[PDB]
Structure formats: C-alpha cells, structure tokens
Amino acid sequence: PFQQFGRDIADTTDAVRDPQTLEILDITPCSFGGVSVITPGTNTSNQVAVLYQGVNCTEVGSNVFQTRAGCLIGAEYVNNSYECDIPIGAGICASYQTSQSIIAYTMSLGAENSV
Amino acid sequence: AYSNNSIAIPTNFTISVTTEILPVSMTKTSVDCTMYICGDSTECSNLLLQYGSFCTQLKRALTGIAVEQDKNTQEVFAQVKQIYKTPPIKYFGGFNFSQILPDPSKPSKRSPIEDLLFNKVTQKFNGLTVLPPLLTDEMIAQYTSALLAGTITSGWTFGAGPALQIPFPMQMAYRFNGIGVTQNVLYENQKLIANQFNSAIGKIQDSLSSTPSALGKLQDVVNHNAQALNTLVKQLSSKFGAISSVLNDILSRLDPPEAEVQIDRLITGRLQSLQTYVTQQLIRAAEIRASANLAATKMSECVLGQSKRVDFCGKGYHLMSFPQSAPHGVVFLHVTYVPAQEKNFTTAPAICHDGKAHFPREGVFVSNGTHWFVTQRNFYEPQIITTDNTFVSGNCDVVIGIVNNTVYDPL
Amino acid sequence: QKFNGLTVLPPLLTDEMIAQYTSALLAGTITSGWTFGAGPALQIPFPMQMAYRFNGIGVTQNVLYENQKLIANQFNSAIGKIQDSLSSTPSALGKL
Amino acid sequence: QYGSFCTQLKRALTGIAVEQDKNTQEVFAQVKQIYKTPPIKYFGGFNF
Amino acid sequence: ITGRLQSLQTYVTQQLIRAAEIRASANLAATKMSECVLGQSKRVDFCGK
Ligand SMILES: *[C@@H]1O[C@H](CO)[C@@H](O)[C@H](O)[C@H]1NC(C)=O
Ligand SMILES: *[C@@H]1O[C@H](CO)[C@@H](O)[C@H](O)[C@H]1NC(C)=O
Ligand SMILES: *[C@@H]1O[C@H](CO)[C@@H](O)[C@H](O)[C@H]1NC(C)=O
Ligand SMILES: *[C@@H]1O[C@H](CO)[C@@H](O)[C@H](O)[C@H]1NC(C)=O
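Output (structure tokens, whole complex):
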C-alpha cells in the first residue's frame, strides 16, 4: 500500500504507480538496436537486404520476414537449405540466387550419408 | 620393489571412461555509444561528435570478437563433411551406445548426457544487446551425432578420407593392437569388455548429475559475462565527480557554461568504462580462443583417430573418444585401457642356447621359478619359446644377465 | 609490505613440496618406466626399460645389450657436462 | 562515491593469484603417490 | 584520485597480459611433462634434439 515505484536488479525503474488512480504499470524501453545491410558483390548486383537487429517487425523491398535475430526486409524465405555464404544469425543465411533476388534460408550441414 | 631380475606384468584390465569439459565460445555482445553514454541527448550527441572517434574502435573490436566467437564453434564441430546416420538395427556387438546416441522419442534429438548437461547449466536500457549465435543448438547436436555415427560405423576412416564400414569388434581389435595388446585378448574377452564399457557409461552418467561442480568452467564463463554486464550497468549510475548522475538534472538546473564541463566529465567517465570493458572482453576472448583451439585439436586427435600421446585423450592408454555438446562448450568422453592386477616374475635379457644368444621378438622373457616363457608386455600370455618368437644376434658372452635354456625348433 | 599497500602473497605449494613431487616423478620413471602414468606402477629393470626405449626409436634391443657399458659411460659424462654447463653460463636462467 | 573500480581491481588480482596457484598445481602433481627409490642405488651402471 | 586509478588500471592490465603468457607457458610445461617424462614421445624436436 505505501510503495510507489519499482526497481529491478540493475537499479532501473521497472514499474511505476500513477499518483491518481490505484493502478501499477510497467516501464519498458521502446525498441532500439542496430541495422545491417546484406548485399552481394557490387559488381554481381545492386539489390540490398536490410536486417534490423532484435526488433519485432511491427515496430519497424516489400518483403518482411521475422527472423530470430531480427526483422529482415528485402529478402524472401525459401523452403530449402544450402551451404550458406552470408551468415545472418540463429541458423538463417542469405544468398543471391534465382529473376534474381536475395533469399533467406536455413543452413544445410551437408549431404546425408548412411554407411 | 626394484630388482635386477624382477618384472611385473598385468594379468587383467579395467576399461575406464572419463569426462573432460572445455569451453568453446562466449556470448556475443554489442554496445551503442549514444544510447549508453548519455541516452539520446542532443547536447551529448553534439559534444561527442567532436570528441574523438573512439566509438568506431569500440564497435570494430566488438564485431571482431563476435566474428571470432562464431568461428570458434565453426572450427570445432564442423570437422566432418557429411551427416552420417546410424543403421536402424543398433547392435554394435554388445555395446550400449544408447546414452550417447540421440533419442528419437524426445522432441529434440539430443542425447541423455547432453540433456543432463543442458539441464544442469541453463535489450538493456543502456544500449547493451546480446547477438544470437549463427549455429543453433540443434545444428551442434546434429554435428555431434554425425561425428558419433562416423566413429561408430567407420572408425577413423571417415577422417582420413571416404567412410569405410567395419564391424565394431574389429575396430576395437585394431585399437587394442594400437595400444600394444594383441587382438586375441579382445576376441576371447568380448563380453567382459562390453559389460565394463556399459557399466562405465552408466557410472559417468550418474556422476555428471551427482556432482554439480563438473560444469565449473562454463558456469564461470557465464558468470563472468553476467558480472561484466552488471558492473557496467551499475557503474553507469555514478557521480564521476559531478553534481548529479542523472543528466536531466544538470541540463535542466544549470546554464550551459558549466553544464558543458559536467557533461564532458560524464563523457570521459563513460568512455573509460567502455574502454575497460572491451579490454577485459578482448583478454577473455583470447583465453576462449586458446581453449577452443585446444578443444578442436583434442577432437581431431582423439575422436577422428587414436592418439599415442600420453595423458592427452584421457588417463591411460587411449582407445576411443566420444564428443558431446554442452552450453558454450564441448564434453569429451574418453575411453581408456588400464591394467588391473599385477603379478611379478623373474626376467632375463636373453637366453643362451648352443652358444647362440636369443632375444625376444616383441615380448619379454618370464619365469615362474621352473620354466621360462615369452609374453607381451601389457598382458600375461605365456608362450613356449621357439625360433619364431625369438631372434638370434651376437654371441653369448657379451650379454649381462643371460640365462641358459632350451629353445624349441618347429622343424 | 610496501608503504603503498602492496603485499606479496605466499604460494600454496612450498619449495619442499615441489621438490618432493619432482623426486616422486624421478623415482617412478626410474623404477617403473612409463607404467606409473598409465596405471599401477610395475617394476622393471632399467636396462630392459632402455631396451624398450631403443625399440621405440627404431634401433633393436641387441644394440643396447651388447653396448651397455658405453651407453652408461656416455650418460654419466653427459650428466656431468650439463651440470658443469648450468654453472658455466649464467644466461640459461634468462626466462625466470 | 567515486565509482566501484576497486572491486574489479581486487577481483582481477585474486583471480590472477588463483590461476598462479593452479599453474604449479597442474604441472608437478601429475603423480598420485610419492614413490621412493630403493636403498641400493645400482640402476645397471647409470649414475643418477 | 584519477591519476592513481589510471595507474592501477594500467598495472592490472599488464598483469593480466603477463598472467596469460605465464598460463600459456605453464600449459606447455605440463604437456611436455606428460609426453616426455610419463612416456616416450614420437614427436620431432619436442622433447629434445
Ligand atoms: C483522484 O480522483 C479520481 C477521480 O476518479 C479518484 O478515482 C481517485 O481515487 C483520486 N485519487 C486517489 C485518492 O486515489
Ligand atoms: C566483378 O566481377 C567481374 C566478373 O567476374 C569482374 O570483371 C570485375 O572486375 C569485378 N569487380 C571488381 C570491382 O573487381
Ligand atoms: C515453406 O515453409 C513455410 C513455413 O511453415 C510454410 O508455411 C510454407 O507453406 C512452405 N512452402 C511451401 C511451398 O510449402
Ligand atoms: C613380488 O614382489 C614381492 C614384494 O612386492 C616380493 O616379496 C616377491 O618376492 C616378488 N616376486 C618374486 C617372484 O620375486
């Protein structure tokens, strides 16, 4: 009844009670982070793909894909698995392959062989 | 007990399995200056824009550390070229690899040892972010399973070149010939060795859960990372020789003439904190890279092949090694060969017969008090001394300690 | 203890303990060979151990058994020479 | 009121001391028992 | 205060680097002990010339 503020292990305000009504609400910082650009060689092509690290796609090419690393804009997901050259993060890789566009896909460990 | 004519040769052996845990990678992190040092204040941005170019070095060092950490796990688990799979019929000559092989019943294809290890060891306001690893848990598990399948089905052949199938008892016989004991020992004592292997696997499975201190290296790594992050966050909220820690109070209380000095002091303090953080991170990254190189070398010389190095792939004579995934590390299961029961005898360097000195060919002469036999060094297998077990060289007078006995001629 | 708060802590293992460990290792390698590292210590005469080492390097056991005295004399001379050398040149301890 | 560096200083120094203690521990203690030579030191003509 | 804190930080940074070098040397010494004293080594130029 007498407490008004809230504070986490790192001494940062977590929840604050508004002085007028008897309600308590959390305080979460609105989304921030870094941005990255995925492109092949500039001689190979000119298209680029932009990855927003650690932000949901709601906060943010017309293609939008939700990766565990972040939001990927400008690349499309494929139901395949290739030996990837551009590591995006969390098992997802991108490459420039066919009429031609950047494609995001899960890594392939290798050919499956049963001795 | 040392004597001029006394030698102790084992008569039995015990198969022992040991565990070694080695760190491989540490958590990837990034720092944003503007969000950390002041937190999107226009005055701080304007001042720091003209205050050096440290942030470029900070970001470059952090990115290099993250790339190196990604490479660390890449160079340890991806030593195989293909994803080998075990045959559906899991007999393996009486050996129970269930505790190390993946369990299809569990939703995640992870071995019971890996499950126990993972059960034991399980965006900040200031601009601290933790990047995800490129290789997920399932990918490392698949790599470990492929390595296990290769070493079970083909032996060491899948590392030198194409995978060549071989029955597991024959592979164990080859390992025994590698350590010095002959193949007969294994073929006659197959069931006992299988039982010892299963018992050792069960015992290490129980031990990994009995003592929680086995995962100390990985626990220390994660604790160090958490301590560094928490120390940075706590140290941000410090006076640093200023009127107040919160920049809002300075910017709303006093005029620019001394607010500039206050914010400059805060800038210096936070820059020093970031520099210390990245220096410690670089030192820790160097240590982790050394550990990862050691782990990769151990994988190469113990899992992909038998090692003659002493005390490298276990305690004793090395036979096999099985890798297991772990949070920010790898666990090695080392199977070793240890003599058990020692019996001493009387030995002589050579035998004098018809003025001809006979020397043992890959063996040692052994006497029980009334007759002399020849046997291997690491196991007691007496044999009648003949002209094929021994070779003749030199005369009888030169050797010191030579004894007289009769050698049988097959012809 | 320096005036500025500098203190040097003593090592957990003393000189005598390290000397005892070294002596134990020497006794093991002299009496048993390499057996005390793999498992239980197994006694073996030193000439037989040297013959095993010779077979390890490629030369046959005959070479040692026929030339035992010469090898013993060479070993003693080498030990004496290194003992003299460790005192002749003070630069050997440069790392420490 | 001036930061908390001294905790990091002391922790780093203590970790260094612990590692230095471990260094000598992992080099000389590879044997499990304290073997002793026999009283008669012949050793086949070798002078140890 | 700032001067002495900087001096202490430099001292412990150099001490950490030297400790890393000494740890590498100690690991090498332990490996040499294991592969030369506890057993014969087939590695070339590792346990002598
Ligand atoms: C303030 O006024 C509001 C009007 O709805 C009332 O609900 C609230 O209880 C008042 N403040 C207090 C005493 O909590
Ligand atoms: C791009 O690739 C083409 C063909 O491979 C090559 O001729 C060209 O030199 C490359 N660009 C650069 C900047 O090297
Ligand atoms: C590709 O995978 C997604 C993921 O569930 C799925 O929704 C989609 O149908 C797949 N594509 C095809 C052609 O089936
Ligand atoms: C074996 O060693 C024991 C003491 O350890 C000794 O009494 C015995 O005589 C030895 N055996 C032979 C055959 O000399």
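The CA atoms of residues 13 and 19 of chain D lie 10 Å apart.
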